[PDB]
Design a protein around this ligand. Structure first.
Ligand SMILES: Nc1ncnc2c1ncn2[C@@H]1O[C@H](COP(=O)(O)OP(=O)(O)O)[C@@H](O)[C@H]1O
Ligand SMILES: Nc1ncnc2c1ncn2[C@@H]1O[C@H](COP(=O)(O)OP(=O)(O)O)[C@@H](O)[C@H]1O
Ligand SMILES: Nc1ncnc2c1ncn2[C@@H]1O[C@H](COP(=O)(O)OP(=O)(O)O)[C@@H](O)[C@H]1O
Ligand code: BEF
Ligand code: BEF
Ligand code: BEF
Ligand SMILES: [K+]
Ligand SMILES: [K+]
Ligand SMILES: [K+]
Ligand SMILES: [Mg+2]
Ligand SMILES: [Mg+2]
Ligand SMILES: [Mg+2]
Lengths: 528, 528, 528, 70
C-alpha cells in the first residue's frame, strides 16, 4: 500500500496535543461577550468573518500529519455538538482540549488509560444527571427572549424578533432565516401555503402592479397529469364562468392547446383564470397536490387508482380559496375552505410518517408539507450593508434560533459557566472502584472550571480568581462578563439551554477520553 | 482539506493593515483636483489609465495571503459604494483605512472590539442623520451643471453637455454614453423611434439622394410571422393603392414571392411600398412590434392568441405615420398617430415590469423599449485622439453623469469634505453607554477629517492645518483645492450629492469596523 | 485574480521612460536622409529591413513589465499616426519621448500634471492653428513630384513614377503597389474592370493570337449560382444569337451539361459565347458580381431573396460591354454601359465602408472592389533582386504615395522640421491661466525643435546648433540635411504635407501628455 | 546652469568680442565691464596639459593589464 510512519509514546502524545491546542486556541477567542471574530480565507472571494466555533474548526487543517490528527478529532467534537444542538461548539472545544491535556499528563507506566476513560464517563453521567435536576422548564415568553439575546452575543433586537416570531407561529413552529436586503431585520409571517412556481403564460396578470395575478374567492382545479386538450379543460371553465368566480389551474403542466384556450378567453371578454404547474418534482407532488386538495376541499384528478377524470367535474369537486396571489416565480394560496376536521387527520398521518422513517431527504420534504399547511411559517430577513457583515450577523442569528428551540423542549440553567460549576459537589460523593477511575473523576472535576475561566480570560480579568469567588458565593450568583461584576443570573437574564450544555460536555468527554488511551500513531508518508 | 496556516493577535493585524494601507495609498492619489492618474497593466493590449477608485482597487491583488485579505475587504467597500451610488469610491477607501488603522491601535487586552463596533455604528447613524438635516434639494439647472462639473474633475464642458442633455430630455430621462470618433464631444438627441434594420430590396429607393426610401403620411402593416405568399399580402396593398398613400411592411421577413410582388408593383406604375424585417431577435420582437403598433395605431398580425390574419385587413387596421425614412441598415418611424392616452398606459406597464424583475438582459431590452418609445433619449459621443484617452474621459463622464442623477433624487451638500467636517458637532453630544462605545465614537470623530485632509495633502499643502482653519471658520466656508484658498462653496460651485457622501461613509464604516474585531486569521498554504 | 506588483512615484516614472527612451532611441536613427535601416528578425524566414517607424515600433516588445508600458504607449502613438495619415511615424515618436521626458521632470510635489496636460493641449491647438495659416495648397504637378521624392527618402525615380501615375488616373484615383518581379519599377495603367480568372474551355479562342477570346458589343450574363442544366442556359443564348451579339457568361461555374452546349454551338456554326467563373471566393463574389452588374447594367441571377431565375431572362436584363478580352488566367471588361450616376453612388458606398471598419481582410477585398470597379487604375510593380530589398523599397513607395495623397487634399508646408520651428512665435503670445499651464506651453515650446534637431544629429552634425541658426534666419531658409548647407526650401524642393505634420504632433501630444500624469503603476507578476 | 549648451555657445560666437554668458544672472553681458575674467596662465596650462596627455591616449592600439587575481 502506501508507505507509513509510526510514532510511540510521549512523542506522539505531544504532537497530537500540539494539534489540539492550536485549533482550540483559535476558537477559544470567540467565547462569550468580549470574544473576538476570526477571519477565514475563502479560496475564491471575499473572506468569512465568523464567531461560530465550528466554522473556525472545520477550516483549520494542518500540514503535519500528527497535529492534523489532533485537529480532526477536535473538529469531530465541534461538529457532533453542532448537529445535535446547534450552539455551544466553543464550549465543547475548550472542554475537549482540557480533557486531552489533563489526560496526557496522568499517563505513566503503571496507569491504565482505558480505566481512566471509564472513570471520566462515570463522572460525566453524574453531572448531566445533576444538570437535569437543577433544570427548570421555560414558561414565560420573556425567558425565550433572554435565551435568544444571550446566545446571539447580546444583541437585544434579535431576542425580541425571535420571541415575537415564536409567539405568532408556536414554540415548535417553523422559523427560517434568509439573506435580507434592507438595513434592518424583518419578521414576515407567511399565511397559508406557497410553492416556488409561477404562472405559465404572462397574460394572466390582472394586477397592473408588480407582475401579479390576484384573485379573491376562486375555485381550484388540481390535476395530477397534464391538461393537454381543449376537451378536458372546457367543463371546469364552464363551471367557473357560470358561478362567476375566477379559477386557478394547478396541474403537472398546461399543454399549448388548452393553454391557447385559456389565454384566448382571458384576453377577450375576460374570463378570470390562471395556470401553474405542480410544486414537484416527482412522487412528492403526488402527495403535495393531495395536501393542497384537502386543505381547500376538492379532488386531485387523474389519480392512479381513483383516476378522477377532468371531463366530469362538479362545483363541489373544485377547491375554494378566499384569496389567490401568483407572481412570475411563485404562487400563494391563503384561506382554503378545506373542512379543518380533515386537514388535521392529514397532519397526523404525515407526522406518523416521519416518526417511522429517516432518510435526511424524505424527512426533509416531509417537514416541508407540515409547515406549508397549518400555522404559517416565519422568515427572518436580516439587515446589513455589505455581504461579509450579513453572513456574520446570520451565523449569530441561527445560533440564537437553535438555542431557543433547544430550550423550549429541555429547560434552562444558569449561564457563564455557572451551570457546570454548580455540579462539582455532585462529583465529590462518587466513590471510585479503583485508583484509575478516581483519576478520571478528578480530570472532569478540573475540567468543569474551564468555561467560566475562559470567559473571564477573554474579558481581560483573572480567570481562576473569578471562578473561585463564584463557587464561594451563593447558588444563584455568578459572573456577568460584560458588566464585569457578580450578579444573580435569572433576575439579570443570563441563562443557557440545558440541552446545549450537556451535549457539548458529552461529545467533548466522549471523544477526548478516547484520545487519551492512545499509545501509537500511524500516519501516511508526506510524499509531496 | 487544504493545509492551512493561522496567525494570532498583533502579528496578523499588522499584515492585514499593510494590505489595507497599500491598496489605499494606491487609490488615495486619485482624489480631488490635483489628484493623479494610475496606469494599470492590461493583460492583452495597451494599458488603462484611470482616476476612478474601483478600477484601481479591483485591479490590485496581492501575493501574500494576509495582505490580500486586507486588499479584498477594501475592494468590497469600493465596490459596494460604486454599485449603490456611482461615485465616491476613493472617499470610501480612505475612510475605510482610517477606521482600520485607528482600530488596530485601541485593541488592548481589556478592550472589547465588538462594543467598539457598536459605538462606531452609533456614531455613523447620528452623522448620516445630520447630513440629512443640513442637506438641501437640487432645484436650479445651474446646480445640475455644477454637480456634473465637479465630479468630472473640474471639466466644465462635461458639466454643460450633461446639463444640456438633461434639460432637453428630463432630469430622469435616458442619457447614454458611447465611444465617440470625432475630436469633440457631441450631444445627439434621438427624437422618435428607430431600429437597426434596413429595407430588403434596393429598388424601393425613391429619393435620388443617399440611398433612402422616404415617405410622408404612410400606412403601416405589422406582421409577427413571415409574409410568404401573394395571398396574404395582396389585400393590404389594395388598401394602400386605393387610398393612394405609401405603405411600410414591418414583418419577421418578406418571402421571395410576396417580395417579388412588392418589387414588381414598385418598378412599374409606381405603387409606394417598402419592406423591413423585425427588430429582433426572438421573444423580444413580439413585444416590440406590439409597442410599435400602439405607437402608430393598429394591430400586429398573426399574433399567437389573437392571430389577427393578413387576409382580412382594413384601413383602420393599418398604422399611420407622418413621415418614414429607411436606409440600407436602419428604419425610423417619427410621428405615429397613436392615441397618446394609451401609449402612456403602455409606458407605465413596461416601467413596472422592470421594477419587478432583473436579469441584466430582460432589463436591458426592457429599457430599450422605454427609450425607443418615450421622450427622445440623449446620447453622448466623446471625442479624443487616441483610445486610452477616450476610456479615461469616459470613466469621468459616467462618474459625472451618475452624480447628477444621485443629486436630483437626494439633495446636495457642501464639498471638499466640508460635508462631513460640518457633522462633528453632532458627535460631540453623543452620550456613550460605556467605555468601549466611547472609543468608537472617537474613532469616527477623527475619521471625519480624513477626506478634506487627503485633498489638501494631494494639493501639496499641510493637510490638518487646512482642516483646522475650516472648522474655526463659518459654516459655508471651506477649501477650494484648485484655487488654493478659502471660499464660500455654493456661490463658488463646490457641492456633492448627499447620497454619495452617506453611502461612501456607510459602506466603509460597516466593513472596516468588523475587520477591527478580529483576533485570528486562517489562510491557505501558498504551496507553489 | 492574478498577483500584481505596484510601484509608486519617481521609481515607476523612471522605468516607463526607460522603455520610451529605448523604443524611441531605436527609431530615431531612421529619420530624414542619412537615416539608417533597422533589421528585424522574422520568427520564420529572412529578416525585414525597414526604415518605417511603425514596423520598428510594433516589433519591439520588452521583457520588464514597466519598460513595456512605456513601449506600448509609444506604439499607440506611432500606430494612430500611421492609420490617420500614412507617414510621419518617426516624427511622432521623438515628439512623444520629448513630451514624456520633459514631463517626467517638472513633476514636483506642488505641480498638477492634469493642468500641465491642459496647457500642453492648449499649446498643440494653437500650433496646429498656425500650420494651417502658413499652409498653401498644392497646385502644380511638380509639387506632387517633390512631395513624393522627399518622403521616399530622396529617390527621384519614385517621384516621377508617382507623379506620372497620378496624372493619368487623377489625384484622387486608385494607385496600388505590388511585389514586382523585374529589376526596375513599372507603371501599368489598367483600363476598365479585371479579375484574375480565365475562360473555362480553351475552345472559345477566336483570336488566332496569344490565346485570347476577344469580343465587341457583347451581352453579359451574371449568375450567382452554377449554370447546371441545359434548361437554364438556352434562353440567354437565344437572346444573344437573336440580336446578333456575342455573350459572356460569368457564373459561379458552368456545369458540363450547359458547357457541352456552349462549346458545341461554338465549334459549329460559331455562336460567339465565352464563360468564366466568378472572382471569388465566398461571400465577396456575392458583392463583387453585383458591383460588376451595375457597372454594365443588368441583374445577377439566382439571388438569395430576389431569386431572379435564369429561365426568364430579357435583353435589357443582360449587361452590355463595349469590348471583352479573356485570356487563360484573367478576364477584362472595358466599357460597361452601366448608368454611371449610380456606380458613383456605389463607389461612395464602398469607400465609407472601409473608413468605418478595418480587419486586414474585409478592408483588403474592400479595396479590391474599388479598383476593380473604377475606370482605369495605376499599379506599381517594384523591381529588385531579393525579397528583403523589395519589401524595403516597397515600404518607402507607400509612404511617398500616402504623402502625395495627403498633400493634394490638405496643403503643404516647409520641410526638415522647419514647419514646426516656424510656429514657436505663436506660443510666445499665449497667456497661461496658471503656473501649470505655463509649464505645459514650455514643454511644447521645447519639443518643437526636436525634429530638425534629430535630423541634424543623424546627419553627423550638432543638432541644436543647426536649430538655432535656422530660427535666426529668414522664414524660407533652413537646412538641407543631404547637401549639408542652408537653402530656400520650396525653390529647392523640400516640403511635407500639413496633414502628416499636424497629426504627428497631435497624436504624440495626446498620448504622452497623459503618460506624464501618472503616479502609480500596477503590473501583473512575471511568474515564469 | 540648466540651459542648452551649444545654443549659448553659438549665440556667443555670433556676438561681439567682449560679449558672452554670465551663467549666474543667466544672460549675455560685456565681461570686463561686468567682471568675469580669468588668468591667461590658468587657461593655457589647462589646455596644454589636457591636449598633451589626451592626444597620446588616442595613439594606442593595444592595452596590457595585470590579471585581477583576488
Ligand atoms: N453577557 C454575558 N455575561 C456572561 N456570560 C455570558 C454572556 N453572554 C454569554 N455568556 C456565556 O458565554 C458562553 C458562550 O455561549 P455560546 O453562544 O455557547 O458560546 P459562543 O461564544 O461560542 O457562542 C455561554 O455559557 C454563556 O452563558
Ligand atoms: N475643485 C475642488 N476643490 C475642492 N474639493 C473638491 C474639488 N473637486 C472635488 N472635490 C471633492 O473631492 C472629493 C472627491 O470626489 P470623488 O468623485 O470621490 O473624487 P474621486 O472620484 O477622485 O474620488 C469630493 O468629496 C469632492 O467634493
Ligand atoms: N533631404 C532632406 N533634407 C532635410 N530634411 C528632410 C529631407 N527629407 C526629409 N526631410 C524631413 O525629415 C522629416 C522626417 O520625415 P519622415 O517621413 O518622418 O521620415 P521617414 O518617413 O523616413 O520616417 C520630415 O519632416 C521631412 O521634412
Ligand atoms: F461557539 Be458556541 F459555544 F457555540
Ligand atoms: F474615487 Be471616487 F471618490 F469614486
Ligand atoms: F517614421 Be516616418 F515619419 F513614418
Ligand atoms: K462562538
Ligand atoms: K476618480
Ligand atoms: K523612418
Ligand atoms: Mg455559537
Ligand atoms: Mg470616481
Ligand atoms: Mg515612413
Amino acid at each position: 500500500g502506501s508507505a507509513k510512519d509510526v510514532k510511540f509514546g510521549a512523542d506522539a502524545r505531544a504532537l497530537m496535543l500540539q494539534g489540539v491546542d492550536l485549533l482550540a486556541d483559535a476558537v477559544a477567542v470567540t467565547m462569550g461577550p468580549k470574544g473576538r471574530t476570526v477571519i477565514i480565507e475563502q479560496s475564491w472571494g471575499s473572506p468569512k468573518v465568523t464567531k461560530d466555533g465550528v466554522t473556525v474548526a472545520k477550516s483549520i487543517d494542518l500540514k503535519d500529519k500528527y497535529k492534523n490528527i489532533g485537529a480532526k478529532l477536535v473538529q469531530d467534537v465541534a461538529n457532533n455538538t453542532n448537529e445535535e444542538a446547534g450552539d455551544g461548539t466553543t464550549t465543547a472545544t475548550v472542554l475537549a482540549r482540557s480533557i486531552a491535556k489533563e489526560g496526557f499528563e496522568k499517563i505513566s507506566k503503571g496507569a491504565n488509560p482505558v480505566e481512566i476513560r471509564r472513570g471520566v464517563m462515570l463522572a460525566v453521567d453524574a453531572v448531566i444527571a445533576e444538570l437535569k435536576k437543577q433544570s427548570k422548564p421555560v414558561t414565560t415568553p420573556e425567558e425565550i427572549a433572554q435565551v435568544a439575546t444571550i446566545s446571539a452575543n447580546g444583541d437585544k433586537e434579535i431576542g425580541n424578533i425571535i420571541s415575537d416570531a415564536m409567539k405568532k407561529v408556536g414554540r415548535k413552529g417553523v422559523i427560517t432565516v434568509k439573506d435580507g436586503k434592507t438595513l434592518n431585520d424583518e419578521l414576515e409571517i407567511i399565511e397559508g401555503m406557497k410553492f416556488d412556481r409561477g404562472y405559465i403564460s404572462p397574460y394572466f396578470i390582472n394586477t397592473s402592479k408588480g407582475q401579479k395575478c390576484e384573485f379573491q374567492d376562486a375555485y381550484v382545479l388540481l390535476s395530477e397529469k397534464k391538461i393537454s386538450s381543449i376537451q378536458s379543460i372546457v367543463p371546469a371553465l364552464e363551471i367557473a364562468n357560470a358561478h362567476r368566480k375566477p379559477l386557478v389551474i394547478i396541474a403537472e403542466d398546461v399543454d399549448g392547446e388548452a393553454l391557447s384556450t385559456l389565454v384566448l378567453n382571458r384576453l377577450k371578454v375576460g374570463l378570470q383564470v390562471v395556470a401553474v404547474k405542480a410544486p414537484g418534482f416527482g412522487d412528492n407532488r403526488k402527495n403535495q397536490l393531495k395536501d393542497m386538495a384537502i386543505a381547500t376541499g376538492g379532488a386531485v384528478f387523474g389519480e392512479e387508482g381513483l383516476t378522477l377524470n377532468l371531463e366530469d367535474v362538479q362545483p363541489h369537486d373544485l377547491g375554494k380559496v378566499g384569496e389567490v396571489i401568483v407572481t412570475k416565480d411563485d404562487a400563494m394560496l391563503l384561506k382554503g375552505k378545506g373542512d379543518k376536521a380533515q386537514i388535521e387527520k392529514r397532519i397526523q398521518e404525515i407526522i406518523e410518517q416521519l416518526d417511522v422513517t429517516t432518510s435526511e431527504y424524505e424527512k426533509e420534504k416531509l417537514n416541508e408539507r407540515l409547515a406549508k399547511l397549518s400555522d404559517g411559517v416565519a422568515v427572518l430577513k436580516v439587515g446589513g450593508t455589505s455581504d461579509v457583515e450579513v453572513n456574520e450577523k446570520k451565523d449569530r442569528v441561527t445560533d440564537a434560533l437553535n438555542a431557543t428551540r433547544a430550550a423550549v423542549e429541555e429547560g434552562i440553567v444558569l449561564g457563564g459557566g455557572c451551570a457546570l460549576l454548580r455540579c462539582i459537589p455532585a462529583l465529590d460523593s462518587l466513590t471510585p472502584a479503583n485508583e484509575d477511575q478516581k483519576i478520571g473523576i478528578e480530570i472532569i472535576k478540573r475540567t468543569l472550571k474551564i468555561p467560566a475561566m475562559t470567559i473571564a480570560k477573554n474579558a481581560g480579568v483573572e480567570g481562576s480568581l473569578i471562578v473561585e469567588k463564584i463557587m464561594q458565593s451563593s447558588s444563584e450568583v455568578g459572573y456577568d462578563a460584560m458588566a464585569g461584576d457578580f450578579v444573580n443570573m435569572v433576575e439579570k437574564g443570563i441563562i443557557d439551554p440545558t440541552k446545549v450544555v450537556r451535549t457539548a460536555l458529552l461529545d467533548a468527554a466522549g471523544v477526548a477520553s478516547l484520545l487519551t488511551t492512545a499509545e501509537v500513531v500511524v500516519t501516511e508518508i508526506p510524499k509531496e
